[PDB]
C-alpha cells in the first residue's frame, strides 16, 4: 500500500484522491495519504479554498517512483515531486505514519469503483497525452486546452488527445461520402482502432482518461473528447460484441460516479439522446440506458 507524503499544508485546500475528497485547514498538521492501492493509476487533485479557479492535479502510479507533494509559495500551488533517495523517503513516510499525520485512502472492501473507472487507463498512455518527459507523473488542470481546441495556444501545456472530426478527410473515404458519414465503422475500425489506437484497450483508456479529466477538473476539452469517442462507437453499425459490452460497463460506472449536481455541465444532451435513442447502438447499452433513465431522465 503506497504513500504520497506532504511536506506541509500552508494554504486551506480541498484535496482529492481519486473519487475521495477532504478539506485541509491552513497550517493543519496534514502530511499526506497512505494505503494507496497498488495496481492502478491515481490522481491527487486540489481546489484552493480562497480561489476555486486553482483546480489542478497529478496523475501518478506509485510503482513508477516515490512521489510527494510540496507547496510552492512562488507558483502558489501544491506540486508533485519525485524523491530519488529511497531510504530518505521510507524514513519520512515511517515518521509521519507513527505520528498518524496521514489520511488513509478510504477504500471499502466491496467497492470496485476506481478499478471500474480506470480499467484501461495506463500511466504510459497518460504521459503521451500529457507531455512532460522529465517527470513520471502528469499535471492536468481545468484550463488546459486540447490539440483539437488549439486548431479551431501553447503546445507544451496541451492535452494531446487523438483528434476525432466526423467531417474530415481522415473520417471520410473519397467515393464513400454518404456511407462513411452515416456509418462511422470505417473511421472507428480501420482509421482509429487498427490505425491509431492498435486495439480497443488503448481507445477505452483514452475515453476513460478524458472522462476523469472532465469530472475532476471541469476540463471542457476533455468532456468534448469523452463525448466524441462515445459518439464514434454509437454511430458505427459494425462494432465488435466485446467492445459494445465493455463500453456499456465503462459508461455505467462513469454515469454512476458523476455527481448529480454536475450532470447539467458534464453531459451533452445531443450526444446522449442520439447514442441511446437514434444510433445504430441504441439497443446495445442496456446498463447505461437504465442508469441514465433512472438518474437523469430530464436530460433525455
Amino acid at each position: 500500500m503506497n504513500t504520497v507524503p506532504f511536506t506541509s499544508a500552508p494554504i486551506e485546500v480541498t484535496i482529492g484522491i481519486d473519487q475521495y475528497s477532504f478539506n485541509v485547514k491552513e497550517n493543519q498538521p496534514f502530511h499526506g495519504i497512505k494505503d494507496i492501492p497498488i495496481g492502478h493509476v491515481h490522481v491527487i487533485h486540489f481546489q484552493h479554498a480562497d480561489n476555486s479557479s486553482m483546480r489542478y492535479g497529478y496523475w501518478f502510479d506509485c510503482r513508477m517512483g516515490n512521489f510527494y507533494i510540496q507547496y510552492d509559495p512562488k507558483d502558489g500551488l501544491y506540486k508533485m515531486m519525485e524523491e530519488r533517495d529511497g531510504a530518505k523517503f521510507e524514513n519520512i513516510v515511517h515518521n509521519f505514519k507513527e505520528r498518524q499525520m496521514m489520511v488513509s485512502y478510504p477504500k471499502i472492501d466491496e467497492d470496485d469503483t476506481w478499478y471500474n473507472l480506470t480499467e484501461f487507463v495506463q500511466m504510459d498512455k497518460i504521459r503521451k497525452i500529457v507531455r512532460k518527459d522529465e517527470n513520471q507523473f502528469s499535471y492536468v488542470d481545468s484550463s488546459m486546452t486540447t490539440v483539437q481546441e488549439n486548431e479551431l495556444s501553447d503546445p507544451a501545456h496541451s492535452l494531446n488527445y487523438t483528434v476525432i472530426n466526423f467531417k474530415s478527410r481522415e473520417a471520410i473515404r473519397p467515393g464513400h461520402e454518404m456511407e462513411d458519414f452515416l456509418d462511422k465503422s470505417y473511421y472507428l475500425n480501420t482509421v482509429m482502432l487498427q490505425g491509431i489506437f492498435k486495439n480497443s484497450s488503448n481507445y477505452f483508456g483514452e475515453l476513460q482518461f478524458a472522462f476523469l479529466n472532465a469530472m475532476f477538473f471541469g476540463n471542457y476539452g476533455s468532456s468534448l473528447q469523452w463525448h466524441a469517442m462515445i459518439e464514434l462507437i454509437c454511430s458505427s453499425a459494425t462494432v465488435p460484441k466485446h467492445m459494445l459490452d465493455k463500453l456499456d460497463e465503462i459508461l455505467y460506472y462513469q454515469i454512476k460516479t458523476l455527481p448529480e449536481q454536475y450532470s447539467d455541465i458534464l453531459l451533452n444532451e445531443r450526444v446522449w439522446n442520439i447514442c441511446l435513442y437514434s444510433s445504430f447502438q441504441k439497443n446495445s447499452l442496456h446498463n447505461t440506458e437504465k442508469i441514465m433513465e433512472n438518474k437523469y431522465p430530464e436530460l433525455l
Binding site: K167, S168, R169, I172, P174, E177, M178, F181, L182
Partner: protein
C-alpha cells in the same frame, strides 16, 4: 454565416457563387396498387444550380434509373445532389469554381460539406431567403428537357435570357424570383399572364418571352397582383384595403 436580408447585395458582387436547390431532385407520383396499398413511381428530376450574378444555370437532370434498387431515397437524394455539385465544381477550371455555395435547404449542408472536404476554401452556407426555385419545373423548356431525358444529362441555360444587356443582376434576380414565386403560387394564372399576347414570343434560344422594358413593367405588375390576389383567396383577406406598404411586405415576406 447565413444568407439573409442582412446583405442581399452580396449575391451580385464579383465573388463567384452558386445557389443549389435540391427540391426537384427526387420527384414521385403516389398511386394505389391493385391490392389497394400505396406505391410511389419516381419521375425524372433536376438539380437547380444557379449563378445569381451571370444567370448561368447548371441543370443536372436526375434520371429515374439513379433510384433503382436504392433505399431511403429522400436521404439519398441529398447525397446524390452533393455528389453532382462536387463533380460540377471539379469539372470547372479553377478561376470559374465558386468561392461560396448557398443551399436553399439546411438539410443539404452536411452532405455538401462532406463531398467538398477537398475544397476547404469553398464556403457552404444556408440562407434565410425563401427562394421559389422549386417552381423551375414550371418553365416549359426546363420541364421538357427533364421529362424527355432517357439518361443522366447536364444542360446549361442562362435563366435571365438576354436581360443583363438592359438591367443589373440585382434587378434580373428580382424579376426571376417574382416570376417563379407567381408560377409557384398560381401556375396557370402566371402562364396566362406570360403567354396571352401572341405577338410577344419566346426566342428559340430563350426561356421567357421577348418583352420590351415597358412590357416587363406591366408583366411584373400583373405577377405582383397575382401573388396579392392568391394571398387574399388563401387567407380570406380583402386585398382592396391593403396599402402599398402592406402589399410590399406580403410579396417580399
Amino acid at each position: 454565416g447565413a444568407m439573409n436580408s442582412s446583405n442581399y447585395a452580396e449575391l451580385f458582387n464579383n465573388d463567384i457563387k452558386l445557389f443549389v436547390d435540391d427540391t426537384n431532385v427526387y420527384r414521385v407520383t403516389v398511386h394505389k396498387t391493385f391490392e389497394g396499398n400505396v406505391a410511389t413511381k419516381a419521375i425524372n428530376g433536376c438539380i437547380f444550380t444557379l449563378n445569381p450574378k451571370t444567370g448561368h444555370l447548371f441543370l443536372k437532370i436526375i434520371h429515374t434509373s439513379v433510384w433503382a434498387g436504392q433505399k431511403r431515397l429522400s436521404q439519398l437524394a441529398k447525397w446524390k445532389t452533393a455528389e453532382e455539385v462536387s463533380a460540377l465544381v471539379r469539372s470547372l477550371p479553377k478561376e470559374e469554381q465558386p468561392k461560396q455555395i448557398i443551399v436553399t435547404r439546411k438539410a443539404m449542408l452536411d452532405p455538401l460539406e462532406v463531398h467538398m472536404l477537398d475544397f476547404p476554401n469553398i464556403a457552404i452556407r444556408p440562407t434565410e431567403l425563401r427562394l421559389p426555385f422549386s417552381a423551375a419545373m414550371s418553365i416549359d423548356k426546363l420541364s421538357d428537357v427533364v421529362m424527355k431525358a432517357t439518361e443522366p444529362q447536364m444542360v446549361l441555360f442562362n435563366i435571365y435570357d438576354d436581360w443583363l444587356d438592359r438591367i443589373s443582376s440585382y434587378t434580373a434576380f428580382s424579376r426571376l424570383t417574382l416570376l417563379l414565386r407567381a408560377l409557384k403560387t398560381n401556375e396557370e394564372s402566371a402562364k396566362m399572364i406570360l403567354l396571352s399576347d401572341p405577338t410577344i414570343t419566346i426566342k428559340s434560344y430563350h426561356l421567357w418571352p421577348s418583352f420590351t422594358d415597358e412590357q416587363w413593367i406591366t408583366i411584373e405588375s400583373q405577377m405582383r397582383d397575382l401573388i396579392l390576389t392568391e394571398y387574399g383567396r388563401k387567407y380570406n383577406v380583402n386585398i382592396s384595403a391593403l396599402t402599398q406598404t402592406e402589399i410590399k411586405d406580403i410579396i417580399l415576406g
